[model samples]
Target: KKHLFLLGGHDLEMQTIVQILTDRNVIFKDRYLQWDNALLSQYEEEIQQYGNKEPFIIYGVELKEDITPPTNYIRIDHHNEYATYPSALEQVASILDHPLNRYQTLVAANAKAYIPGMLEIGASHEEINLIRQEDRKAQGVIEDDEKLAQEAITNGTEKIGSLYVVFTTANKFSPICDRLYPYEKLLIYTPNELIYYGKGINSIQKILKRYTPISNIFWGGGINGFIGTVRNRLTTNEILNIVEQIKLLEL
Candidate 1:
């Protein structure tokens, strides 16, 4: 049976999914895109073409309404509605009956969080760091990314209520967010998206959920809810105001 593999996201976990499929010599038609409306649209088109004939294995891609995929369509993802689900790699490996080796487990751990899982699995600190470096390289984060994040930390950072915020229009903002993870209540605002990583974010998540009609908000990541939306049109001040309102509710 012909399988359609809709690939999205650029993380190591997504790459591992591809590797698992390729290794099995699965005959599949594949499409790649970031996890967004564009990917969802493509999935819709593919469904229209294939109908119930072929199975779909969507990895790390989002789907829109009216995309009533055939029963054979298997969406293996770990985001949005599947936030509490296993990593995409784990799902694919399980579906394909391919047990993950140690290295594969490391890749999955990085996607689903880090360190603790590796440690629990008896991975040494040195082994964990090596995979961390490899994963950083896979994400294409370079020294310039570190510098941009550092600059954002030094210049673009401010305190909004009790939350520490870093506002930057940097193209490579993930590294900036990475460097700023020390602050428990941290919000990284890029022109393209706003990401909040910390505990007690249910209130913030609730507020972001209100904008679901206008933005593509997603919750799920390390710390339970790593909220972000690439297509956000809200100003930094507007989101900061939302967080401020949440702070007020607590006080």
Candidate 2:
């Protein structure tokens, strides 16, 4: 059977999956989907070359109305609404009959908080340290990014109606998120995005559902929602207005 593996993004998680598949000589194709320009339609020209005649194992690539594959496709993803599902790596591992090693388990853990499962799989202390070092190295965020997060936290953090608001123009969001790790209810506002994280996300999702038609508002992370726009349609003040309105909700 000819299987076409369509990969979603090119982050550390996807890279790990790529390494696993490559080591086993699995033939796969990829389209990047990490940041703002994530629309799958742009890749239709590339995808058409493969055609939809064979079985496809899609990993983490989001589906939109503009693109459709027939019944011969299997989408292995755990992002957005599928947050409770296994990570794409774990799902692919099961399908490929590949048991995850300690490093792969750690990579899966990074995706959707599969930490406890890592212990179940078991790992040596040395292996764990090496995995941590490798994962950090792969992320490539420098100390300057760490300082950016610290500066944002020091100046932009504020508690308003059970939400910890942070505003920054830092190039990467992970550092900012790491700096505020303990806080559950957070609205991290950058020039390019607005993200809400907490138990209130579901309610907030419903409240902002109307805006999705006009902008890119999405939910994932099991407890987080993100709001953004294509072509910069959603202004900073507009997003802040929405966040401020969320503060008035029952939450």
Candidate 3:
């Protein structure tokens, strides 16, 4: 079987690639493409079917708008040059006994930063250590199927971030938000509070307008539940539309 890679996100680039594949009948599957959990589950069989025929490689980046990928899988969020498309594709191709080609050049040619201003503010060594410890704890919980690693990360930190955003509603916000603020300087907001302030429903442009210095915003409170419920009601195309709208202001 041909090696299959899965990429999920609300970013415009991802949306465009998804559309291109769909238009070409590439047989890709994404649960968040539609809000419906039922459909998402149903597609699992399809994914399995492919796995049975040939070894398959599936990968996705977790955005605030969707649930994190299962813990058994690797999560790639770091901005190393090797984490880009060509590198990823090359990795997959190598696994499948294929050629690597000029993936490095390809990645460099199309490279674009997702959250612009946020990258410059480096995390302190203490903060980095905390994140690593959280990752280990999260891995433990997820390994036992007791909790999600992403959730563990949220609970482990208090006053997370230089801006001091707590993890009150992190589950809700992860699916919709593209990038995370440094854990040390995170700014947490509850869904209700966000709505009350009129910041919750604002477009990416509007939100960026006020949080001018905020390269990326973390959405907490009610985001996970909201996405869970919404995934049950929308189609992949529709969900992709929502994700794209959020990435509009991404630099």
Candidate 4:
């Protein structure tokens, strides 16, 4: 059997994928350091040494830049904020046509738009119900988010309110995780900072506010940024236009 999967950690997404792979008796790397050409090359060397170099796929991970694989390698990574999928789990569901992948709620609620998009892609009732089960769990977490947000919402008129912008900070042990609760949603650092986004949060913040005053992940220099979700009720085209505008911001 060829090692064909490099899963995420011990999270729900990884667990669901692991189940599927296990059902198929697939071979996978027990652990991995994300994904890079160096690591994949090492995989190639090891597998080839053993008279096998069969290609594999990765879920919850992506291939690094400037490094190509041998051939037939695929990655189902939704974090490609740059990719055209609603979420990584949802994408894997589509590719594998599995309801389990579609319904897994590791972090489906992260984006309000995520679940609906997955349903459109043929997510099953079982998965949707699982999401409902998870939604209840989320409500418990949400039980007091409103209050914390209100606390974080003192008088301030920045480009975007701290609440509106999801702050993907550079530190996992962010001094923030202590000061802020996970439910607040105002702060959203990947801790590992897998996405460069210009190395540090403050640096990205500096460029946006300094050049245009847009506080957000998608501020490509339109109005620089929105003060709130005030204009959020517009047409989908308007949203598309905003993304185009963000593209213009050019990072």
How do the predictions measure up, each by TM-score? 0.79, 0.77, 0.31, 0.42
**Per-residue lDDT of model 4, residues 6-90, tens digit only:** 5542333444555666676666654533222214444544334433244444332333322344444565554323333444445
lDDT of model 1, residue 111: 72
Please identify model 4 stretches exceeding 4 Å from their true place.
1-3, 8-10, 32-60, 63-66, 101-170, 173-251
Question: Which parts of model 3 are misplaced by more than 4 Å?
Answer: 7-9, 23-25, 33-42, 55-114, 117-184, 191-251
Better of 2 and 3 by TM-score: 2
Tens digits of lDDT, candidate 3, 37-137: 22223345544555335344444333222333333333323222222233233333334454423322232122232122113234344543443333233
Question: Model 2: per-residue lDDT, tens digit, 178-238?
Answer: 5575565777776555777665566776656655453366555555433333324567666
Per-residue error (Å), model 3, residue 1: 5.3
The RMSD of every model to the true structure, in order and in angstroms, is: 3.5, 3.9, 17.7, 11.6
* Candidate of highest lDDT: 1
Clashes in each model (backbone N, CA, C under 3 Å)?
0, 0, 29, 7
Each prediction's whole-model lDDT (CA): 0.65, 0.62, 0.33, 0.37
Task: Please tell me which predicted candidate would have the highest TM-score against the true structure.
Answer: 1
Assess candidate 4 and give its TM-score to the true structure: 0.42
Positional deviation of residue 197's Cα in model 1 after best superposition, in angstroms: 1.3
Q: Where is model 4 poorest over a 10-residue stretch in terms of lDDT?
A: 219-228
Ranking by lDDT: 1, 2, 4, 3
